[PDB]
Coordinates of C-alpha atoms in Angstrom, one line a residue:
Chain N
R1 CA 102.8 47.6 97.9
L2 CA 104.8 44.8 99.5
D3 CA 101.9 44.0 101.8
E4 CA 99.3 44.1 99.0
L5 CA 101.4 41.9 96.9
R6 CA 101.7 39.5 99.8
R7 CA 97.9 39.3 100.0
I8 CA 97.8 38.6 96.3
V9 CA 100.4 35.9 97.0
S10 CA 98.1 34.4 99.6
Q11 CA 95.2 34.2 97.2
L12 CA 97.3 32.8 94.3
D13 CA 99.1 30.1 96.3
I14 CA 95.9 28.1 96.5
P15 CA 95.8 24.4 95.8
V16 CA 94.6 23.5 92.4
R17 CA 91.5 21.3 92.7
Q18 CA 91.7 17.9 91.1
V19 CA 88.6 16.1 90.0
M20 CA 88.1 12.4 89.1
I21 CA 86.3 12.3 85.9
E22 CA 84.5 9.0 85.1
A23 CA 82.9 8.7 81.7
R24 CA 81.6 5.2 80.9
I25 CA 80.7 3.7 77.5
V26 CA 77.9 1.2 77.3
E27 CA 77.3 -0.8 74.1
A28 CA 74.3 -3.1 73.8
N29 CA 73.7 -5.3 70.7
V30 CA 70.7 -7.5 70.4
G31 CA 70.3 -9.5 67.2
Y32 CA 67.6 -12.0 66.2
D33 CA 67.7 -13.4 62.7
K34 CA 65.5 -16.3 61.4
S35 CA 65.7 -17.7 57.9
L36 CA 63.5 -20.5 56.4
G37 CA 64.2 -22.0 53.0
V38 CA 61.5 -24.3 51.8
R39 CA 62.3 -26.6 48.9
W40 CA 60.2 -29.1 46.9
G41 CA 62.2 -30.9 44.3
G42 CA 61.2 -33.8 42.1
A43 CA 63.0 -34.6 38.8
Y44 CA 60.9 -37.8 38.3
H45 CA 58.1 -35.7 36.7
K46 CA 60.2 -32.5 36.4
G47 CA 58.5 -30.6 39.1
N48 CA 61.0 -28.7 41.4
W49 CA 60.6 -25.4 43.2
Chain V
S1 CA 62.5 -20.4 41.8
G2 CA 59.3 -21.8 40.4
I3 CA 59.2 -24.1 37.4
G4 CA 56.5 -26.3 35.9
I5 CA 57.6 -28.7 33.1
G6 CA 55.3 -30.7 30.8
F7 CA 57.1 -33.0 28.3
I8 CA 56.1 -35.2 25.4
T9 CA 58.8 -37.2 23.7
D10 CA 57.4 -40.4 22.1
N11 CA 54.9 -38.9 19.6
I12 CA 56.6 -35.5 19.5
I13 CA 59.1 -33.9 21.8
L14 CA 57.4 -30.8 23.3
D15 CA 58.8 -29.4 26.5
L16 CA 56.7 -26.6 28.0
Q17 CA 58.1 -24.9 31.1
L18 CA 56.7 -22.0 33.2
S19 CA 59.4 -20.3 35.3
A20 CA 58.2 -17.8 37.9
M21 CA 59.9 -15.9 40.7
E22 CA 58.3 -13.5 43.2
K23 CA 60.4 -11.6 45.7
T24 CA 59.3 -9.2 48.5
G25 CA 61.7 -7.5 50.8
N26 CA 60.9 -4.9 53.5
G27 CA 63.8 -3.3 55.3
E28 CA 63.5 -0.7 58.1
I29 CA 66.6 1.1 59.6
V30 CA 66.1 3.4 62.5
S31 CA 69.2 5.2 63.9
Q32 CA 69.1 7.9 66.5
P33 CA 72.1 9.8 67.9
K34 CA 71.5 12.1 70.9
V35 CA 74.1 14.8 71.8
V36 CA 74.0 17.2 74.7
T37 CA 75.7 20.5 73.8
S38 CA 76.4 23.8 75.5
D39 CA 74.6 26.9 74.1
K40 CA 76.3 28.5 71.0
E41 CA 78.9 25.7 71.0
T42 CA 79.6 23.0 68.5
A43 CA 79.3 19.4 69.5
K44 CA 79.7 16.2 67.5
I45 CA 78.7 12.5 67.7
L46 CA 80.4 10.1 65.4
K47 CA 79.8 6.3 65.0
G48 CA 81.3 4.4 62.1

C-alpha cells in the first residue's frame, strides 16, 4: 500500500500548468453627420421661409 | 417654416398668410451582437 500510495504521490505532485490569457477589446466608431439649413428671409414684402 | 403674406392697409387692412411645413425623416438602426457559446451552456453579451 505504501508503494502504491507513493506512485499516486508521484502522479499528484505534478506542476500546475499556467497559461497566459490575452483577451483584447477593439472598439471602432465612425461617424459622418451633415446638416444643411437653407434660409430665405425678407421682411420688406413679408416673405420669409 | 413656410409663410406667404399678402397685405393691404391703405384702402382696407387685409393680411392673408399661408403657413406650411413639410417634414420627412428616415431613420435606420442596425445593431448586431454575435456570441460564441458552448453547447447547452448559457452565454451573454451586454452593451449599454
